[PDB]
A and B are shown apart, each in its own frame.
Chain A
Amino acid sequence: PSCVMDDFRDPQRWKECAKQGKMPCYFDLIEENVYLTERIKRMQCECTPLSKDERAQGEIACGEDCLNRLLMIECSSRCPNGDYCSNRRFQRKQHADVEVILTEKKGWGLRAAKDLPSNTFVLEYCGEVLDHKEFKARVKEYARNKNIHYYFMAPKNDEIIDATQKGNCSRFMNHSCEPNCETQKWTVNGQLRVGFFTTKLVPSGSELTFDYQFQRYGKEAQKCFCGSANCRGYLGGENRVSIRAAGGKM
């Protein structure tokens, strides 16, 4: 079982494919984070604009030496390189070509549909941004529902991104003690956005994974099936954390 990302656009066909076990269970697809209604501008880079001949010669706009990129800030529409700017990947949704696949023991997963060079933007981790009090409410709800999969991302020093009910296909990225992706915290238009990026050349067909650095507050630990010869055993490690520490409250 395998399905490309444009399969998730028709919710009726998606829902019916899911009833047949060929697609994962329905969730609300979103293109950008949804906040729970909480929600002079010039952060230009210093790249000298590419001439229209340089464009024609293959030069990159806002490449590796772009001051915005080097600080993990995306350029805006006003970037000196304009339409050429290659540092608007989150905003333009310039994702890697990936598929959602069914794994043996971890539920559904993400695999590369073509070779991805190292340091390649995979997908943004989108979800609902929760404050600490809605986080606790969802902890209770997901526990009482007896969910198996959890989808809480805790950006360091920041609110939880919950992709359990709304998100994109990045919510399928499984954990590995020996991963081939990393998260990267980027700012787009003053807002934090978290992206998955490759850390090595991922060959076509390989599962994409990252290190959850998972913080378990559940009583019962989850054995890790990443299969790495240096596998840490359980998703959460040896010790359980409180609910407030898991949610990043000191």
Chain B
Amino acid sequence: APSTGGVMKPH
């Protein structure tokens, strides 16, 4: 897996 990272979500 990547060390860090993510995605923002409106709801």
| B-binding residues in A (CB < 8 A) | 139-140, 142-143, 146-148, 150, 152-156, 160, 175, 183, 185, 194, 212-220, 222, 235-236, 243, 246-248
| Residue ID in chain A nearest B8 by CB atoms | A212
Chain A proximity mask over B1-11: 1 for CB below 8 Å, otherwise 0? 11111111111
Q: List 25 A-B contacts (CB under 8 A).
A: A139-B5, A142-B2, A143-B2, A143-B4, A143-B5, A152-B7, A152-B8, A154-B8, A154-B9, A154-B10, A194-B10, A213-B8, A214-B6, A214-B9, A216-B6, A217-B5, A218-B1, A218-B2, A218-B6, A219-B4, A235-B6, A246-B6, A246-B7, A247-B7, A248-B7
A-B contact count (CB 8 A): 77
Partner of B2 from the list A185, A217, A247 (CB cut-off 8 Å) is A217
| A-binding residues in B (CB < 8 A) | 1-11
A243 and B5 alpha carbons, distance in the complex (Å): 9
